[PDB]
Design a protein around this nucleic acid. Structure first.
Ligand SMILES: [Mg+2]
Ligand SMILES: [Mg+2]
Ligand SMILES: [Mg+2]
Ligand SMILES: [Mg+2]
Ligand SMILES: [Mg+2]
Ligand SMILES: [Mg+2]
Ligand SMILES: [Mg+2]
Ligand SMILES: [Mg+2]
Ligand SMILES: [Mg+2]
Ligand SMILES: [Mg+2]
Ligand SMILES: [Mg+2]
Ligand SMILES: [Mg+2]
Ligand SMILES: [Mg+2]
Ligand SMILES: [Mg+2]
Ligand SMILES: [Mg+2]
Ligand SMILES: [Mg+2]
Lengths: 56, 190, 176, 199, 138
RNA sequence: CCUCGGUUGGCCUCGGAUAGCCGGUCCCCCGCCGGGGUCCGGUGCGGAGAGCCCUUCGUCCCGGGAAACGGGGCGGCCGGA
RNA sequence: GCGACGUCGCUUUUUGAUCCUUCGAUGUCGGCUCUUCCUAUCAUUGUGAAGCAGAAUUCACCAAGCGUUGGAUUGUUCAC
RNA sequence: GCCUAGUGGGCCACUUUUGGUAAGCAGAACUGGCGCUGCGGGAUGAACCGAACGCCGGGUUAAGGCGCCCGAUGCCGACGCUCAUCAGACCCCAGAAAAGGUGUUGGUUGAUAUAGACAGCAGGAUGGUGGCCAUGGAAGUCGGAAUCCGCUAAGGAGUGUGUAACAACUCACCUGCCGAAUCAACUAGCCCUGAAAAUGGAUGGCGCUGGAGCGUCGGGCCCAUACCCGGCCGUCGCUG
RNA sequence: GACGGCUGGGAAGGCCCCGGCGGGGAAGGUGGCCCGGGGGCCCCGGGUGUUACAGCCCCGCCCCGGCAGCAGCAGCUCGCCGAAUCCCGGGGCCGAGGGAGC
């Protein structure tokens, strides 16, 4: 089996609104520059970034 | 489960001319003709064999409540066949304890006049279903004979007599008087 | 899993991450019936986490591929051994189906369980699906099609296209 | 301009939904033979549904309370009205576009009646499910003109058979006329056969 | 009395779906509402096809219930269903519907004039037969 | 002359069944031409609403087809709650 | 016909619990009068079951159509 | 860094949680809401779901839906289940349980089956034995202790009606027709019983049963002030 | 409308037992043979059995057999795609700005 390399680029789209967001999730989203619904950013993937996406 | 096919065939005698217009069955014998309709069931009625020897009933793609209506049609057509060949004779007996039940038959055997059922002055008038002959049997003291070709009219008329001679406001296990269906046979034996 | 559309069967092979203790971990193969490979890999981690002490973080997936049917033109009988949770209790079942594809058989099983038992796809675990010959079937709704000269009509042909005129003169024929 | 619908064999709500949409889209609708409308479910169930309708009245003044019409025409009319927005001017005009009848009255007995296969009993019900008759339900709840409607309907049907036998005589005369003139219409029949209007 | 039965070898006419307007041979039945069909001469691949979209025809091939596409084509081209289907009134009133669909405006004008004549030539002789009935009924 | 407006060719009609229908037919059997058994066709309804009817730019010459029993229009009889 | 030891409910014709509405005011007990509604039916209609022989009485079903009184004592509801 | 208004009655929800039989009850934690806030959806609605708002045009969506009210399935949508003489119909949420059903559908376990079953229709039910013990007598035929044999296809020292005790009759058991499945115990879906309140009545209504119901799913479509594009206004920033 | 990539370097399938020569097998059992009855030799039943007067499944290469073709001309047997991707056409809404110079 050839296992491909784990991907290093992710495109993240915020799909919920700005209403009723818990403050940890809201903080990670503004650190991800996703402050509107349907805003998109490219995120490079490592353990620190994947654990933030895991929060949100 | 939808069973793909339930069929049952009925053998038809030489004495009987049978016909079908869709899901009505027209049975012809020595004693007359019987029509019964079956459009409430949605089956296939096939009339197979030349000289019309077997009547076959099919139910395609039926659940249990639709499969149960195949043998019902076959038993109804069989009862019509024995109605036109041998007839139906329901022999009722009039059980009394102290007051003899006096039965008078009127209008060719189409009305029953029941008197002195438990010493009542009320006279019960039971009109027969059309085509059912009603008769007091000879060589037997308290008996009455119903004769016809439709079993569902002969037995309904017997039920009408039976539920007309009913005891009220007493214990019916002690007050056993009434006119009850005792024998179920044919008019003409074989 | 939400059993969306036609399921697809996936060979998903996974293993642990090679620690200095276990230099090469054993490899585990599972057939997952899933809408797509992302859901297939998630159900693989569900089942492997239930069977072994292996997680997605401690493990990896070395292969995930759709396994095509070798005879999608041949009518086969399928035996599916089932584990599901009702509202009270968990039950083992065995069910039998008839299809051309084992993925079609499993999605037929999922909709059939949803119909007959009000059970959703998250509460249903496939354990084994095997193509069974016609002699070894136990279900009469499958066994009634085991006839070489099979013959049935289509009795009460309901009128589809109920709105092609929506206002016609002639009442329809349902006998054909 | 008028959509005349034979009410026989139709289901009440399905026909009333389609009629309500047509009178909202601005088409005058006449539904004839409303005693022939069928209602799904067993007759005792439907009878107790209309009996529960009858039990409702204004407790202080039933003459102001809900009017339980007994004719099948007016019952079907009430179902279409409940399917219409009848408390606005568009709703009232939609209702006024709709005529309902018992039997087939003399404006519409010399007229072809339309049928809606999406509302028919034979299409819309499984053959083993038991249905009810609007005329029988209506009569048993208080409609008085069931028997006289039946007598006028057999009076209409026996004249409709006369019209039908004459129409059949005309059409067999039409067929003998085609085989008579198939020499001088053969050069015009081929046009209608090549463009698919005949065979 | 049913005449059209789903059986191995019945030609069915596909009413809707992607293979509408075509003829298939019923090769096997799978369950209550689906059959493995195969049209090897009408360009339909062997596939599961539901019963509600096929319409049964009065043509029955003889092949086994698991025989492959070439034996199906052997039976089809031995029975010549491509011409016997065309000889029926069913395919003729399909192609008449197709021709009335393909009518152009000049076609509709020529149809209107030819029908305008044919109806009047029939209509005079209809009344001629009617009064030839009344003059000979007395 | 005001005013209310909508509309932009008609369908002049079996009863109905839906595990069945439709149309012809006599050598029949019953009735006051109507009904049924027989036979012949039709049935993804083509004696088809996936339909039918009408179909219009107008006038002038001459010819062919179709019509002549016709086209247009004043005196009588039937047809309807 | 009952039914212990246990257990599941219903109802708001009991008293509680709570304090949501009303303190720029919703007239606070009884009885008299009068109308209507409910059924968990005492009687009457139709019924089934009894350790229902008859009579009487129980238990149950459809059932609220029609009835369910005159008085002594007490302000009484209740009670007798 | 200064000055500083208003506030210092709160309430609701997931999860945790104390008192209380419980409560639209009283009291805490965490976070989010409502208050302070319109909008699409939940028929209706302080708090639920979606989403937060300048004035507009086009497009698209979310959550919800698409028989008619009422925009949208008028798809030739898929596979089943289900009949209710009290059907069912969508978070909050607006009404039900234990128990029960040869209603109907599935599944589990075990037998009893072509070394031919299960009904159903008939036939045999034997001698030892009419058993010691009790009881007047009980002889398989009130009771308790005995529960073996053989000719066997079979028959228990007998499952029941028998009689003062018997005689009789009946059952198991074993054979004839018969020709493909059958019996039992459970379990889970829908439906039904359980299930009774007062003005007339509420899946929102009409109504719906080849669903317009329930479960699992597919295409398509509908539109919010949400998102994109564009206009216009203002504000802020670029200490432009 | 056209092109291409990948996969199990697609899976199945198509043509030349109609792939050749062998070896078997069993059934949702084809011919035959036997039984049974229903017609005017035929059909439907029940039994037996292994190719015959149908078929199915398991040197299979006798160069992955040899050819087509290939995520397939319907405008459908099952995908993910596009630096391994482009062309063409139609419908709707809008025209903000106003000294850019050469
Ligand atoms: Mg939210
Ligand atoms: Mg008494
Ligand atoms: Mg006040
Ligand atoms: Mg006041
Ligand atoms: Mg007041
Ligand atoms: Mg009661
Ligand atoms: Mg609190
Ligand atoms: Mg408080
Ligand atoms: Mg405040
Ligand atoms: Mg705020
Ligand atoms: Mg808000
Ligand atoms: Mg609501
Ligand atoms: Mg949420
Ligand atoms: Mg907009
Ligand atoms: Mg809505
Ligand atoms: Mg903008």
């Amino acid at each position: 089996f050839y296992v491909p390399a784990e991907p290093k680029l992710a495109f993240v789209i915020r799909i919920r609104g700005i209403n009723g967001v818990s403050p940890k999730v809201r903080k990670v989203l503004q650190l991800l520059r996703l402050r509107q619904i349907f805003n998109g950013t490219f995120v490079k993937l490592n353990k620190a970034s994947i654990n933030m996406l895991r929060i949100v | 489960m939808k069973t793909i096919l339930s069929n049952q065939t009925v053998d038809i005698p030489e004495n009987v001319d049978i016909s079908l217009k869709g899901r009505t069955v027209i049975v012809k014998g020595p004693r007359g003709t019987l029509r019964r309709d079956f459009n409430h069931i949605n089956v296939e009625l096939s009339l197979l064999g030349k000289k019309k020897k077997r009547l076959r009933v099919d139910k395609w793609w039926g659940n249990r409540k639709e499969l149960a209506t195949v043998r019902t049609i076959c038993s109804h057509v069989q009862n019509m066949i024995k109605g036109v060949t041998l007839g139906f004779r329901y022999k009722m007996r009039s059980v009394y304890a102290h007051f003899p039940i006096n039965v008078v038959i009127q209008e060719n055997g189409s009305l029953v006049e029941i008197r002195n059922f438990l010493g009542e002055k009320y006279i019960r008038r039971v009109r027969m279903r059309p085509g059912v002959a009603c008769s007091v049997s000879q060589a037997q003291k308290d008996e009455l004979v119903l004769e016809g070709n439709d079993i569902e009219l002969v037995s309904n008329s017997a039920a009408l007599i039976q539920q007309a001679t009913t005891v009220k406001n007493k214990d019916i296990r002690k007050f056993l008087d009434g006119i009850y269906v005792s024998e179920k046979g044919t008019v003409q034996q074989a | 899993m939400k059993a969306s559309g036609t399921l697809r069967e996936y060979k998903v092979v996974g293993r642990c991450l090679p620690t200095p203790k276990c230099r090469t971990p054993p490899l585990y193969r599972m057939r997952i019936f899933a809408p797509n490979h992302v859901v297939a890999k998630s159900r693989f981690w569900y089942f492997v986490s239930q069977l072994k002490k292996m997680k997605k973080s401690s493990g990896e997936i070395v292969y995930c591929g759709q396994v095509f049917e070798k005879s999608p033109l041949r009518v086969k009988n399928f035996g599916i051994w089932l584990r599901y949770d009702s509202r009270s209790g968990t039950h083992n079942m065995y069910r039998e189906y008839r299809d051309l594809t084992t993925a079609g058989a499993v999605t037929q099983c999922y909709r059939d369980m949803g119909a007959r038992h009000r059970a959703r796809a998250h509460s249903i675990q496939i354990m084994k699906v095997e193509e069974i010959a016609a002699s070894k079937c136990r279900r009469p709704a499958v066994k009634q099609f085991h006839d070489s000269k099979i013959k049935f009509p289509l009795p009460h042909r309901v009128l589809r296209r109920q709105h092609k005129p929506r206002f016609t003169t002639k009442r329809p024929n349902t006998f054909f | 301009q008028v959509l005349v619908l034979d009410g026989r064999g139709h289901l009440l709500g399905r026909l009333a939904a389609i009629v309500a949409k047509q009178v909202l889209l601005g088409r005058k609708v006449v539904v004839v033979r409303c005693e022939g409308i069928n209602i799904s479910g067993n007759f005792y169930r439907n009878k107790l549904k209309y009996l529960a309708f009858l039990r409702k009245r204004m407790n202080t003044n039933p003459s102001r309370g809900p009017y339980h019409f007994r004719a099948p025409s007016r019952i079907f009319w009430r179902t279409v009205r409940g399917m219409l927005p009848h408390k606005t001017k568009r709703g009232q005009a939609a209702l006024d576009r709709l005529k309902v009848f018992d039997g087939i009255p003399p404006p519409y007995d010399k007229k072809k009646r339309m049928v809606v296969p999406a509302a028919l009993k034979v299409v819309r019900l499984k053959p083993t499910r038991k249905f009810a008759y609007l005329g029988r339900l209506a009569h048993e709840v208080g409609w008085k003109y069931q028997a006289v409607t039946a007598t006028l309907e057999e009076k209409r049907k026996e004249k409709a058979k006369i019209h039908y036998r004459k129409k059949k005589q005309l059409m067999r005369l039409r067929k003998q006329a085609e085989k008579n003139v198939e020499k001088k219409i053969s050069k015009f029949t081929d046009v209608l056969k090549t463009h698919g209007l005949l065979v | 009395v049913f005449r059209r039965f789903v059986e191995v070898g019945r030609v069915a006419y596909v009413s809707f779906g992607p293979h509408a307007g075509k003829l298939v041979a019923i090769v096997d039945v799978i369950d209550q509402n689906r059959a493995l069909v195969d049209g090897p001469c009408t360009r339909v691949r062997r596939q599961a096809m539901p019963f509600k979209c096929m319409q049964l025809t009065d043509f029955i091939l003889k092949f086994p219930h698991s025989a492959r596409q070439k034996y199906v084509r052997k039976a089809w081209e031995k029975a010549d269903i491509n011409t016997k289907w065309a000889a029926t009134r069913w395919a003729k009133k399909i192609e008449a519907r197709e021709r009335k669909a393909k009518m152009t405006d000049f076609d509709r004008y020529k149809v209107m004039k030819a029908k305008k004549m044919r109806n009047r030539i029939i209509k005079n002789e209809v009344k001629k037969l009617q009064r030839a009935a009344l003059l000979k009924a007395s």
